[PDB]
Amino acid sequence: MLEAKFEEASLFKRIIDGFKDCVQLVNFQCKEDGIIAQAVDDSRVLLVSLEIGVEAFQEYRCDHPVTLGMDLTSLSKILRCGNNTDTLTLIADNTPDSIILLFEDTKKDRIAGYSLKLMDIDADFLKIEELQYDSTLSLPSSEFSKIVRDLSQLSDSINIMITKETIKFVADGDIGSGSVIIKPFVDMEHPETSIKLEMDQPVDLTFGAKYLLDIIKGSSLSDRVGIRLSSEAPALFQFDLKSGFLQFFLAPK
Amino acid sequence: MLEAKFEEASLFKRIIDGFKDCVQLVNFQCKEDGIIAQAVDDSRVLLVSLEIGVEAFQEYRCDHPVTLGMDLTSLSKILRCGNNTDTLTLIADNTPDSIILLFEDTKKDRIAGYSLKLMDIDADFLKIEELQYDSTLSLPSSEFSKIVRDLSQLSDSINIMITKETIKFVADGDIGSGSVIIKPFVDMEHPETSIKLEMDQPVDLTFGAKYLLDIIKGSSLSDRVGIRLSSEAPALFQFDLKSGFLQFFLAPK
């Protein structure tokens, strides 16, 4: 048996939102300390990686390991029906054919439950090693969205350059041309607004805008996003959850 | 989908307690206005009949009719695990192979769920008609237990006679012999303790003690029990629930 209950259904919706647009079928591997879910883009360009620990749930129980392979387009249509402020409880038995999603509001005395047919996903193992990066930075995730959403109009590629106190984004296409420079800064009154940069080595990297358009969809999960960049390895984008994260690994062109 | 949630798991335990000892396999027929479950004794002597309306649950949802055929010995072993003060939620999908029982305590942040395999019961339809009875009476259900438990030791049969202000029980066997006479009475300060009798016609009936031993197991569900007796028809024993009842129909020897 598995019982994983979110205080706010919304949390789970937004988790599925960072995923559904760039991968369709994902296994969710539940065990005693919580859930990880990890998927590749088809084209092997984008790896997505979720961790939700026990502490993220209102109440959680998983005595024996289960894999919940579920279609995110389907899952997402069921999640659409929940009030975004409801209780969400996931329930699945020992060897599951199905998952049960149960929206509950103890205030209004309203209860709803939906059933989602699990499927056999059979994905490639993902070997995600822990690395050292040339540069590390954080900023409000919504500042990151706005830059990505704006420059994306102009080019399929966005170039990111990091130099001593400079984070530079550039997009150059057929119609137009964009350039944004942000500087690390400490915000006395509002530290959540700060841009932090830690640079061991300058970096200069190009990424497909389409993939950055996918990653910025993790934004609703966290005020801030952490970007780790390196000349040899894929870049890493991370949105911290209360007791977990959503990570994207992206390869430069 | 079906979601039927009891504020107190205990209510459901005691409901299953009035049943499990005299019938093993019962269908529970859920629909929009709630659940009825009805079973015969093998020997066709004892009919059991449950009604639980919507108002009996904390929250209830059943849009489409489902039959939950379940083994009460099994069901009862799962129910044993619940804290008697917990939340119990029953969940079953559209066409169910299984039922899910979910014990929850929002105070301790403890959650447990168990799965029970439904089975195909195939019972006889029960034609339960509404009748006129010679005599009708109520009394504390626990007074009824004590009389039945005591006289049962002495004889496989208990004789019940009703005359103008007299309710008489008699048991006569090989070892011993018992006689209890209770008189209708109004209890000023404590009306729940009253014995009420309404007699249209005297009655004189014998019943198998074993079957009365089964019926008095409905006692934990209600302070009072109503007994309706007639010379032509089976006797009717009823424990009222908050918005339903548990009935037993019993044929005299």
CATH number (domain holding residue B168): 3.70.10.10
**Burial class of A94 by CB neighbour count within 10 A (0 to 12, 13 to 18, 19+):** exposed
From the list A2, A94, A102, the residue facing B3 with the nearest CB is A102
Written as six digits, the tokens of A160 are 């990111």
CA–CA gap between residue B172 and residue B179 (Å, rounded): 9
Structural domain span for residue A19:
1-253
Gapped junctions in chain B, after residues (C–N > 2.5 Å)? none
Integer-rounded Cα Rg, in Å, for chain A is 19
**Count, residues in chain A:** 253
Asked if A98's CB is within 8 angstroms of B93's CB, the reply is yes
Method: X-ray
In sequence order, the β-bridge partners of residue B207 are B158
Residue of A nearest to B97 (CA): A97
Written as six digits, the tokens of B248 are 């037993």
Asked if A111's CB is within 8 angstroms of B3's CB, the reply is yes
- Do residues B223 and B141 make contact, with C-beta atoms less than 8 angstroms apart? yes
- Do residues A116 and A98 make contact, with C-beta atoms less than 8 angstroms apart? yes
CA distance to partner chain B, nearest, from residue A102 (Å): 9
SS (H, E, C) chain B: CEEEEECCHHHHHHHHHHHHCCCCEEEEEEECCEEEEEEECCCCCEEEEEEEEHHHCCEEEECCCEEEEEEHHHHHHHHCCCCCCCEEEEEECCCCCEEEEEEEECCCCEEEEEEEECCCCCCCCCCCCCCCCCEEEEEEHHHHHHHHHHHCCCCCEEEEEEECCEEEEEEECCCCEEEEEECCECCCCCHHHCEEEEECCCEEEEEEHHHHHHHHHHHHHCCEEEEEECCCCCEEEEEEECCEEEEEEECCC
Instruction: Mutation target for A interface from B1, B5, B90: give the one with most A CBs within 10 A.
Output: B1
Going along chain A, which residue ranges are E strands? Answer: 2-6, 25-31, 34-40, 46-53, 59-62, 66-71, 87-92, 98-105, 110-117, 135-140, 157-163, 166-172, 177-182, 196-199, 203-208, 224-229, 235-241, 244-250
CA–CA gap between residue B112 and residue B41 (Å, rounded): 33
Instruction: Mutation target for B interface from A66, A99, A100: give the one with most B CBs within 10 A.
Output: A100
- What is the SS3 assignment for A18? helix
Spell out which residues of chain A touch residue B58, defining contact as CB-CB under 8 Å. 109
Query: Which has the closest alpha carbon to A18: A173, A240, A231?
Result: A240
Query: Which has the closest alpha carbon to A93: B59, B112, B88, B105?
Result: B112
CA distance to partner chain A, nearest, from residue B114 (Å): 7
From the list A61, A89, A94, the residue facing B112 with the nearest CB is A61
- Listed in sequence order, the residues at least 6 apart from B223 whose beta carbon sits closer than 8 Å to its beta carbon are B140, B141, B142, B192
CA–CA gap between residue A74 and residue A51 (Å, rounded): 21
**Burial class of B233 by CB neighbour count within 10 A (0 to 12, 13 to 18, 19+):** middle
From the list B5, B110, B114, the residue facing A111 with the nearest CB is B5
CA–CA gap between residue B192 and residue B190 (Å, rounded): 5
Q: Quick check: A104 contacting B, CB < 8 Å? A: yes
- Residue B133 has phi, psi (to 5 degrees) of -115, 145
**Burial class of B241 by CB neighbour count within 10 A (0 to 12, 13 to 18, 19+):** buried
Written as six digits, the tokens of B212 are 């009365």
- Do residues A243 and A223 make contact, with C-beta atoms less than 8 angstroms apart? no
CA–CA gap between residue B242 and residue B253 (Å, rounded): 33
Asked if A59's CB is within 8 angstroms of B109's CB, the reply is yes
Query: Which has the closest alpha carbon to B12: B95, B103, B93?
Result: B103
DSSP code, position A218: G
- Do residues A234 and A249 make contact, with C-beta atoms less than 8 angstroms apart? yes
Integer-rounded Cα Rg, in Å, for chain B is 19
- Do residues B214 and B168 make contact, with C-beta atoms less than 8 angstroms apart? no
Spell out which residues of chain A touch residue B1, defining contact as CB-CB under 8 Å. 112-115
Position of tokens 């619940």? Answer: B82
CA–CA gap between residue B181 and residue B205 (Å, rounded): 15
Asked if B110's CB is within 8 angstroms of A1's CB, the reply is no
Q: Quick check: A112 contacting B, CB < 8 Å? A: yes
In sequence order, the β-bridge partners of residue A3 are A61, A91
- Do residues B185 and B131 make contact, with C-beta atoms less than 8 angstroms apart? no
CA A80, A82, A87, A90 dihedral sign is negative
- Do residues A144 and A195 make contact, with C-beta atoms less than 8 angstroms apart? no
Residue of A nearest to B2 (CA): A113
CA–CA gap between residue B34 and residue B244 (Å, rounded): 10
Q: Quick check: B55 contacting A, CB < 8 Å? A: no
DSSP code, position A12: H
- Do residues B91 and B99 make contact, with C-beta atoms less than 8 angstroms apart? yes
Asked if A91's CB is within 8 angstroms of B93's CB, the reply is no
Q: Quick check: B63 contacting A, CB < 8 Å? A: no
Written as six digits, the tokens of B154 are 């002495």
CA–CA gap between residue A84 and residue A205 (Å, rounded): 38
> What is the amino acid identity at position B37?
A
**Burial class of A108 by CB neighbour count within 10 A (0 to 12, 13 to 18, 19+):** exposed
CA distance to partner chain B, nearest, from residue A33 (Å): 15
Resolution in A: 2.5
Position of tokens 């990424």? Answer: A207
- Listed in sequence order, the residues at least 6 apart from B37 whose beta carbon sits closer than 8 Å to its beta carbon are B19, B26, B27, B28, B29, B48, B49, B50
- Residue A234 has phi, psi (to 5 degrees) of -55, 155
Written as six digits, the tokens of B123 are 């019972």
Pairing mode, strands B2-6 and B98-105: unpaired
Query: Which has the closest alpha carbon to B115: A221, A190, A94?
Result: A94
Counted domains in chain A: 1
- Listed in sequence order, the residues at least 6 apart from B107 whose beta carbon sits closer than 8 Å to its beta carbon are none
Q: Concatenated DSSP letters for A140-170? A: EHHHHHHHHHHHTTT-SEEEEEEETTEEEEE
**Burial class of A114 by CB neighbour count within 10 A (0 to 12, 13 to 18, 19+):** middle
CA–CA gap between residue A212 and residue A208 (Å, rounded): 7
